[PDB]
Subunit: 74 residues, 3 copies
Amino acid sequence: DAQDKLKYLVKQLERALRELKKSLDELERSLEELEKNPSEDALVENNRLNVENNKIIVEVLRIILELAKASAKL
Amino acid sequence: DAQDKLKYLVKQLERALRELKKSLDELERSLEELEKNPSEDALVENNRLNVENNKIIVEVLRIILELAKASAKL
Amino acid sequence: DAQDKLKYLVKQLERALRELKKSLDELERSLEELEKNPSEDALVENNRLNVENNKIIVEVLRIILELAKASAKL
Ligand SMILES: N[C@]12C[C@H]3C[C@H](C[C@H](C3)C1)C2
Ligand code: NA
């Protein structure tokens, strides 16, 4: 089962990275707006999106730990 | 030795992810306070915690590089 | 070819982590300046560097997905 589960975990990783990429693009657009017209409001929104992006990174790292455990059987 | 070292590196990864999770929870609480009562002070604290969270992510990635090197022997 | 490609991907990972580390050091220095003399300008620069650091993390994760695919052949 170990090889087949690895393949599934790799597909989960690809899905999560797609989600991370879309988040990163939103974050960068936020930073461009902030650099153009800085304000408290823009700053909070920018931070919100940075936090969200870190949260998704942690989810991606969780999947990599599951990949590492699956490997460390075989 | 390669298989046994891999198992140890996997335990190190699990420990570091526990630390990252606790950090993420602190960061999210900071963002909730910031969104409630935005101020310069809240903003700096929020950034401090975001930076700290990135620093731990880099430590987690270091461990994954060590896992990748251990794998690439066998 | 799978073993040799893995070795190459591991070297790519080491290069990218060197780049991430240098970024992290810049980000931390930014945060020290911000904590010393907080201002809107310092805040935007700090966020800029945090965003940049997340962007490099995503590139590092891309390489780890390529390492996971290379493994999941063998
Ligand atoms: N074999 C591994 C490939 C990839 C990098 C590292 C951790 C995970 C994901 C398993 C080694
Ligand atoms: Na920020």
